[PDB]
Design a protein around this ligand. Structure first.
Ligand SMILES: CCCCCCCCCCCCCCCC(=O)OC[C@H](COP(=O)(O)OC[C@@H](O)CO)OC(=O)CCCCCCCCCCCCCCC
Ligand SMILES: CCCCCCCCCCCCCCCC(=O)OC[C@H](COP(=O)(O)OC[C@@H](O)CO)OC(=O)CCCCCCCCCCCCCCC
Ligand SMILES: Nc1nc2c(c(=O)[nH]1)N[C@H]1C(S)=C(S)[C@@H](COP(=O)(O)OP(=O)(O)OC[C@H]3O[C@@H](n4cnc5c(=O)[nH]c(N)nc54)[C@H](O)[C@@H]3O)O[C@H]1N2
Ligand SMILES: Nc1nc2c(c(=O)[nH]1)N[C@H]1C(S)=C(S)[C@@H](COP(=O)(O)OP(=O)(O)OC[C@H]3O[C@@H](n4cnc5c(=O)[nH]c(N)nc54)[C@H](O)[C@@H]3O)O[C@H]1N2
Ligand SMILES: CCCCCCCCCCCCCC(=O)O
Ligand code: SF4
Ligand code: SF4
Ligand code: SF4
Ligand code: SF4
Ligand code: FES
Ligand SMILES: [Mo+4]
Ligand SMILES: [S]
Lengths: 86, 975, 86
């Protein structure tokens, strides 16, 4: 075990492996701040978008008006409004 | 009055001199990495930054003035504390989970935790130095050193060795030993102070290395990358501090911390032993320790190797012709009972002597005398106090009535003057000497040293007089005559508190300054200075030891010291008194419990029919009325066919009694000899039965130190093999003779003895729990006596007695014996070294005995270091290597006791003893020197502390740190 | 163990550590709603975009738009916006 641990620690001593473990722990702390409780409706909407994007066959101007489009682009603008706090 | 407002709330200050002292008593959070109450303020860590009236100041040094508005919570004070901590963390690497100092008591660890620190502003940079692991007992890790100077304060101003200093003038400051030499080669006396006071692992005991933690055993090759991985990964300090705290908590399963009282000398140091299984990790001293505080010497701090020595006796030995047979405990006890009963029936009870050990506990002394008087029926009991301060107790009994020191070690550190007569105080009572050295070095206490050898106390004394061997009473009587006749004696004291004054002044008649200058050799002019210093000092403590008592007039010279103190009025008041420094760890307690031929416990005379009758009712048997033999007298009675048996416990009599050729001759004649010891001592070789006894760490009990301070022992280890603690053995021997004793713990022995001994009436194990102590006389109400004779002297009229004493000329050996062989001990070694030679770290720096030769005598006889010579006296001869040093002068040499063969000092000594107390005159030994070999390796290695180079100074020199360009006070970081 | 658990619980009692564990459990519930079965083609397309991005002003935005490769992506992006709306 003394040799196995010696090999293990010596190979993990690289600053590439240290960063991987450092950011893995910090990633959980980041996820703790992220309010995933209120993500429920957003995930259901992004789910419905993925479903419609698989059924495929100046158009940018024509498409920017549809009732389905307006709900999404206004929600996208509402998301940008939220990112303006202190 | 002194009213202060801390953090808004107003409060009344009590006796706190500093702001930090008040904050601590008020339970207000404030970092203090470099503050240790035993050392005082240092101003090095800069973490106690509080705002004293808007000004950011270090609270440890800030004096608490009346009407001060101190704040310890504003964002600026906290931002200043963290700045100071950042510099500590830049000089100290936190690796707690894999650090041996992560035992919950690490001041850096708990300060980082207390301060809710998660990041480190200044990254840890390694210092450009390697670890100084040269010393056998401790090591320096400069990379972990925060330069707090706690070790420097301890070495300089507490221990007063002056080895440690901090090179502030260097690019990267570092703790220096002497003029930056390796620890092992320096003047470091190995006291342990520096590791004890260090707030982190920077100065640690080698015993702790790899042992204390669960992950500290991992080789540094694997552990170093683990620390580097963890350092990089780390999210915050609090996360990995929690992991380290859980591991620190787990250590409680393996590491056992037990309070004990030092088995070595009479200073009575108590401390905790840290043990993982049978391994002693470190001796951890505690501030609550009544006699020593955080102080220790090499013996108590690091000299415990003997307890685990492979040479430890684990099975009783019964002599089978030309060898010892290992035998069962039952057969050894049955043989002792059969032979003791045989000699008691055929030759009487007085044909059996019993020797108590002053290494053993109070209860063990009590049981040895209960066996001798209550079971065997003889008063033939005694202890090593016979060769020791028996003349000093005779002197105190004649004048002040109590067989103990006048006060505590605290009174010695308080004294205006300390008169030291024939006492190597820093080597024989090291922790007691640290109080004198500190008082002289810092408080300006006057120290007078009367001695024939220039030791540390002589080198540091205000006045070092060198009287001729045995002439001490001549100058002592002359000081009293001059002070009485010049009107400088305390006549108000002598009046209402003393008796026999006119008869005393009549006996002082021959001791004029001319006579004193003629006999002692001390000139009249310096004799005036001694008398003026003694007289003008408000409080004088007179400390004497074997230089005074190991003489034919030892009892009288001791009486002269007490008489002088009576004259100058130095009794019944703090800072003054008679202090005959008690030898062994428990010599005071062994005598306190009746291990003397003339007295029962509590010093109650044996011939006192009223005392005897009290013990007869309690013990249920008649006590012998006639006194017994002394320890010295016992060998004479074997030679004259009067003593057929001897039961000697923990005493190396075959080497420590005077004239060991005559001692050994009496051992061959002796019918039955039982030696009870932890090792097969020189004495044990002459035994018919050897009983394996267990040392202090393997038993419970109490010890009474030089201050009459009864202290309790807790069991560190269980008794090794079949070795039993001495009380258990004595009890089992008595039971084999039909005693029917039913003790289960030494506390049962103490309860019986406290009822009988009046000076111990109020002592109970409950009053001695933990670091608690009691100084005798202790009345039944538990009220002790820290300072004796405050109200009255213990005589029918409450008055002390001046005792007429005469000079008894020291024994002259003959004109052919021109060398006066002075003898004693060494700081590091305890007697012949049965205990200290087992410590390999002590052996490493002091491997052997040596004969100190003066440069004068070495020039005359052509002696160099290592020259084998032969000192020959009319009693025997020693062959010993030589060591030249100005510690000895002219034809007086010095032969320490640390040898068990060819160089045993007691081969030279004669059986001539004190006229009143039979204490062998060891300081009256003459011999003739014959060169045997010219070339030999020096008996004292380069690494011995005596080959050092101290760097004396007051404090840490923190002003040198502040003088640097890089120093920026944390408080000053405002704009 | 009583002390180890005491230290562990006392250090984790922080509101910051409680949120980290709360959102970690909530994250799995969010993933349960997310239809990752239909993500297969979208992941293959985002994979092909990353591959082409490795191989390295106002006038160019006009030229690049309506390109055959671009039109397929911007129409799929518009189809995703159409889905988000109920
Ligand atoms: C099949 C292919 C090979 C599979 C190999 C699997 C290897 C798994 C791990 C090996 C450990 C076995 C066990 C082993 O090698 O034990 C050996 C290790 C060292 O033992 P020593 O013989 O040097 O002595 C230990 C002394 O403390 C007391 O004697 O003992 C421990 O106390 C380890 C405790 C856990 C140590 C935690 C390691 C953490 C590594 C990362 C460090 C940074 C953390 C932040
Ligand atoms: C190197 C460092 C290694 C550190 C190891 C990592 C820590 C391992 C766990 C600590 C020891 C547990 C093992 C241990 O000794 O625990 C001790 C725990 C308390 O025991 P006591 O001695 O106080 O008495 C137990 C009584 O229930 C009955 O006598 O006993 C349990 O009942 C534990 C049950 C499982 C755990 C309970 C829930 C855990 C916390 C969940 C909520 C908070 C989130 C976290
Ligand atoms: N390190 C250590 N400490 C010990 C011990 C030990 O073995 N090792 N043993 C313990 C024991 S049992 C004892 S009793 C005490 C002994 O404690 P001390 O009595 O302090 O010790 P020693 O060095 O034996 O005493 C001799 C001292 O008296 C001086 N001296 C010799 N002759 C005279 C004289 O005629 N007049 C004067 N004024 N001075 C003289 C010597 O030069 C030396 O300084 O120490 C206890 N402490
Ligand atoms: N020439 C000369 N001779 C002297 C002196 C001097 O200055 N010069 N000093 C004299 C004086 S003051 C004294 S007190 C004596 C010292 O003489 P001793 O009192 O004989 O001293 P130490 O050599 O410490 O002997 C202690 C013994 O006790 C044993 N021991 C230790 N702990 C225990 C324990 O718990 N139980 C048992 N049963 N045994 C234990 C040790 O192994 C060792 O054999 O020397 C005296 N002899
Ligand atoms: C008894 C095993 C000793 C060998 C292991 C050496 C590691 C000791 C742990 C102390 C902390 C590591 C010291 C360091 O990295 O500076
Ligand atoms: S000495 Fe104290 S602060 Fe430093 S690593 Fe060890 S436990 Fe932590
Ligand atoms: S070695 Fe001295 S200066 Fe360094 S941390 Fe220890 S006590 Fe402080
Ligand atoms: S004498 Fe040695 S062990 Fe004692 S404090 Fe000084 S340097 Fe440290
Ligand atoms: S001074 Fe005496 S009691 Fe204190 S540690 Fe040293 S040997 Fe032990
Ligand atoms: S304790 Fe005040 S600065 Fe260190
Ligand atoms: Mo002694
Ligand atoms: S002693």
């Amino acid at each position: 075990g003394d040799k196995v641990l010696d090999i293990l620690v010596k190979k993990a001593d690289t600053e590439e492996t240290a960063n991987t473990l450092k950011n893995l722990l910090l990633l959980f702390g980041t996820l703790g701040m992220l309010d995933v409780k209120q993500l429920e409706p957003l995930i259901l909407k992004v789910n419905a978008g993925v479903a419609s994007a698989v059924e495929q066959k100046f158009d940018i101007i024509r498409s920017l008006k549809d009732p389905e489009i307006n709900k999404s682009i206004t929600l996208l603008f509402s998301f940008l409004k939220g990112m303006g706090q202190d | 009055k002194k009213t202060i407002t801390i953090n808004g709330v107003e409060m009344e200050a009590s006796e706190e001199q500093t702001v930090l002292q008040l904050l601590n008593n008020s339970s207000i959070e404030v970092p203090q990495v470099c503050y240790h109450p035993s050392l005082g303020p240092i101003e090095t860590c800069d973490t106690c930054i509080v705002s004293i009236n808007g000004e950011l100041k270090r609270s440890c040094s800030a004096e608490l003035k009346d009407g001060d508005v101190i704040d310890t919570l504003s964002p600026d004070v906290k931002k200043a504390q963290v700045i100071g901590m950042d510099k500590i963390l830049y000089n100290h690497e936190l690796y707690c989970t894999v650090c041996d100092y992560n035992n919950g008591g690490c001041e850096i660890h708990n300060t980082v935790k207390e301060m809710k620190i998660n990041h480190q502003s200044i990254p840890f940079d390694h210092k450009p130095y390697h670890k100084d692991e040269s010393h056998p007992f401790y090591r320096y890790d400069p990379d972990q050193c925060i330069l707090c100077g706690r070790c420097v304060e301890a070495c300089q101003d507490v221990q007063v060795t002056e080895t440690l200093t901090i090179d502030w003038e260097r690019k990267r400051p570092r703790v220096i030993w002497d003029n930056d030499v390796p620890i092992n080669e320096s003047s470091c006396v190995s006291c342990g102070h520096c590791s004890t006071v260090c707030p982190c692992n920077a100065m640690m005991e080698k015993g702790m290395e790899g042992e204390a933690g669960y992950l500290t055993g991992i080789n540094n090759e694997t552990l170093r990358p683990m620390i580097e991985i963890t350092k990089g990964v780390e999210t915050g300090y609090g996360s990995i501090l929690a992991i380290s705290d859980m591991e620190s908590a787990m250590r409680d399963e393996r590491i056992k911390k037990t309070k004990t009282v030092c088995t070595y000398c009479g200073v009575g140091c108590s401390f905790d032993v840290w043990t993982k299984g049978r391994d002693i990790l470190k001796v951890e001293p505690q501030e609550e320790a009544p006699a020593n505080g955080i102080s220790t010497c090499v013996k108590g701090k690091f000299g415990w190797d003997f307890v685990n020595s492979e040479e430890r006796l684990t099975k009783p030995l019964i002599r089978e012709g030309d060898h010892f047979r290992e035998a069962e405990w039952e057969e050894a006890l049955l043989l002792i009972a059969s032979k003791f009963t045989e000699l008691k029936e055929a030759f009487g009870p007085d044909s059996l002597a019993f020797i108590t050990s002053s290494k053993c506990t109070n209860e063990e002394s009590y049981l040895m005398q209960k066996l001798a008087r209550g079971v065997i029926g003889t008063n033939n009991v005694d202890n090593c106090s016979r060769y020791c301060q028996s003349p000093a107790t005779a002197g105190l009994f004649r004048t002040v009535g109590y067989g103990g020191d006048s006060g505590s070690i605290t009174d010695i550190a308080q004294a205006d003057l300390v008169l030291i007569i024939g006492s190597n105080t820093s080597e024989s009572h090291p922790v007691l000497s640290t109080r004198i050295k500190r008082a002289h070095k810092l408080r300006g206490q006057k120290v007078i040293v009367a001695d024939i050898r220039k030791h540390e106390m002589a080198e540091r004394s205000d006045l070092f007089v060198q009287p001729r061997a045995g002439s001490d009473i001549v100058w002592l009587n002359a000081i009293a005559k001059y002070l009485i006749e010049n009107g400088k004696a305390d006549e108000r004291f002598l009046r209402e508190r003393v008796n026999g004054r006119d008869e005393y002044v009549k006996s002082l008649a021959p001791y004029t300054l001319e006579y004193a200058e003629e006999k002692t050799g001390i000139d009249q002019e310096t004799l005036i200075q001694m008398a003026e210093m003694i007289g003008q000092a408000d409080s004088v403590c007179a400390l004497w030891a074997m230089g005074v008592t190991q003489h034919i007039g030892g009892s009288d010279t001791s009486t002269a010291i007490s008489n002088l103190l009576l004259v100058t009025g130095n009794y019944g008041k703090p800072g003054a008194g008679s202090y005959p420094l008690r030898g062994h760890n428990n010599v005071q307690g062994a005598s306190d419990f009746g291990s003397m031929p003339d007295r029962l416990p509590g010093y109650e005379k044996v011939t006192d029919e009223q005392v005897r009758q009290k013990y007869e009712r309690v013990w249920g048997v008649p006590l012998p009325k006639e006194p017994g033999m002394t320890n010295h007298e016992m060998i004479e009675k074997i030679h004259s066919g009067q003593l057929k048996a001897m039961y000697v416990k923990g005493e190396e009599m075959g080497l420590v009694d005077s004239n060991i050729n005559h001692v050994h001759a009496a051992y061959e004649k002796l019918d039955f000899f039982v030696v009870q010891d932890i090792f097969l001592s020189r004495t044990a070789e002459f035994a018919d039965v050897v009983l394996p006894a267990s040392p202090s760490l393997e038993k419970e009990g109490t010890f009474t130190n030089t201050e009459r301070r009864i202290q309790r022992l807790y069991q560190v280890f269980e008794p090794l093999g079949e070795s039993k603690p001495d009380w258990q053995i004595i009890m089992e021997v008595a039971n084999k003779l039909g005693a029917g004793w039913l003790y289960e713990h030494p506390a049962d022995i103490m309860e019986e003895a406290a009822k009988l001994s009046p000076i111990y009436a109020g002592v109970t194990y409950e009053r001695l729990e933990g670091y608690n102590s009691l100084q005798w006389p202790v009345n039944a109400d538990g009220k002790d006596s820290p300072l004796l004779f405050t109200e009255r002297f213990p005589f029918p009229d409450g008055k002390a007695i001046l005792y007429p004493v005469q000079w008894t000329e020291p024994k002259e050996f003959g004109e052919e014996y021109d060398i006066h062989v002075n003898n004693g001990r060494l700081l590091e070694h305890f007697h012949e070294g049965n205990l200290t030679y087992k410590s390999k770290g002590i052996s490493e720096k002091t491997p052997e005995v040596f004969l100190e030769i003066s440069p004068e005598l070495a020039a005359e006889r052509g002696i160099q270091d290592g020259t084998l010579v032969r000192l020959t006296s009319p009693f025997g001869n020693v062959k010993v290597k030589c060591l030249i040093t100005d510690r000895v002068k002219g034809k007086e040499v010095y032969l320490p006791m640390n040898d068990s063969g060819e160089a045993a000092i007691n081969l030279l000594t004669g059986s001539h003893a004190d006229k009143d107390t039979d204490t062998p005159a060891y300081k009256e030994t003459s011999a003739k020197m014959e060169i045997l070999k010219h070339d030999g390796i020096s008996p004292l290695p380069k690494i011995n502390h005596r080959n050092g180079n101290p760097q004396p100074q007051i404090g840490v020199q923190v002003h040198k740190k502040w003088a640097r360009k890089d120093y920026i006070f944390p408080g000053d970081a405002v704009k | 163990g009583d002390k180890v658990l005491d230290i562990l619980v006392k250090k984790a009692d922080t509101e910051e550590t409680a949120n980290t564990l709360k959102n970690l459990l909530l994250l799995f519930g969010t993933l349960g709603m997310l239809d990752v079965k239909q993500l297969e083609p979208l992941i293959l397309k985002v994979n092909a975009g990353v591959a082409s991005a490795v191989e390295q002003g106002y006038f160019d935005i006009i030229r690049s738009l309506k390109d055959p490769e671009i039109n397929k992506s911007i129409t799929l992006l518009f189809s995703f916006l159409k889905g988000m709306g109920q």
